[PDB]
Amino acid sequence: VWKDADTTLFCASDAKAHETEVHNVWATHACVPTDPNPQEIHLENVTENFNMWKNNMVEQMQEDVISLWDQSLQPCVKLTGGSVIKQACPKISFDPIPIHYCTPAGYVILKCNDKNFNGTGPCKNVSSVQCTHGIKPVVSTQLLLNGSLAEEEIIIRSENLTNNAKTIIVHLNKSVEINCTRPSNGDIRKAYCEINGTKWNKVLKQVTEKLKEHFNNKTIIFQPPSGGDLEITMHHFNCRGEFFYCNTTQLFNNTCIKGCNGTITLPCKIKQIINMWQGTGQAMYAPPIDGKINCVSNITGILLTRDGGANNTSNETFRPGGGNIKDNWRSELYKYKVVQIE
Numbered sequence: 001v002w003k004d005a006d007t008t009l010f011c012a013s014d015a016k017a018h019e020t021e022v023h024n025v026w027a028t029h030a031c032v033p034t035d036p037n038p039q040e041i042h043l044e045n046v047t048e049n050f051n052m053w054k055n056n057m058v059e060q061m062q063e064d065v066i067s068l069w070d071q072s073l074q075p076c077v078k079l080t081g082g083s084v085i086k087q088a089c090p091k092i093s094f095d096p097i098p099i100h101y102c103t104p105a106g107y108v109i110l111k112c113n114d115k116n117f118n119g120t121g122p123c124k125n126v127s128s129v130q131c132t133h134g135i136k137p138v139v140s141t142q143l144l145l146n147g148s149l150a151e152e153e154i155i156i157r158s159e160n161l162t163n164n165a166k167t168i169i170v171h172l173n174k175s176v177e178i179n180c181t182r183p184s185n186g187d188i189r190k191a192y193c194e195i196n197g198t199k200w201n202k203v204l205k206q207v208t209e210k211l212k213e214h215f216n217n218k219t220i221i222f223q224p225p226s227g228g229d230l231e232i233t234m235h236h237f238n239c240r241g242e243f244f245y246c247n248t249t250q251l252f253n254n255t256c257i258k259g260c261n262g263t264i265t266l267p268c269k270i271k272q273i274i275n276m277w278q279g280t281g282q283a284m285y286a287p288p289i290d291g292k293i294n295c296v297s298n299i300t301g302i303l304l305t306r307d308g309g310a311n312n313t314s315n316e317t318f319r320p321g322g323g324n325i326k327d328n329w330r331s332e333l334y335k336y337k338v339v340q341i342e
Ligand SMILES: *[C@@H]1O[C@H](CO)[C@@H](O)[C@H](O)[C@H]1NC(C)=O
Pocket: 113, 114, 125
């Protein structure tokens, strides 16, 4: 028997000690080895309540990723709280690895196995585990990359759909590849992401259908982010250590929901000067490495903000972008909660 509790988790990974890649290096020192024979017990006729929006596992993962980034991604110049910090900024090897989140003795993690669980409320099919699945700490905006997929239907998740200020996480049930490249050989910061338009528009159509179920069949309209920093108005992510900013206007194309089944090519740029997602200020990095810089990722989730004040109209307008990296972890941790064992 148990009760919802918070405690300090630890992490486990398969980091390689000989690797210089920074997530490996961090996990080699900050985490223990994974369990090759992990226990998972189904809790017979047990119903548990979960609330992904109030889940300290998220705050803890955020804490780790901040620490990882802080010790791994030194910029040449950091502008924070009005001070200027200068230091060496060598190119690094960067490629996220899965990190498992684990309970210490006297606690356990309950996992909701209801396939269509929306993240808050009762779960009928619950199991207990010592660690979460391995979650890659992929930092991005607008699109969630290399994550886990919903096992059945597309799921719409929100702390309160009625409140337009609350971010919506769209959990996809089918991956769509996004293939980003800064080609080897003009402009060294010019890059692009290629997406399969037929596949992407099919999924986006489905997301639209799902949104209708939640918004009384109102008309669903996508628009580009209203304004803000580039990290939010663009799909922002890190590829091989380089900070990419990609224009997603083409991805949220209302008319495709004409002959538009071809490759979607998003224009991207690599930026040396960025606003740190940690919310701490600005950083400047060295220019991109030479050669073909390339990441192919699965889009597995979408972060959306709904326009407020549209209650009198027959439309609901959505714009890509969540307002919080914690939501990235939320999207992976929603099915977990820590409890204390009696
Ligand atoms: C509950 O979830 C488990 C693990 O995901 C799955 O294998 C099983 O089919 C489900 N069990 C029940 C009682 O439906």
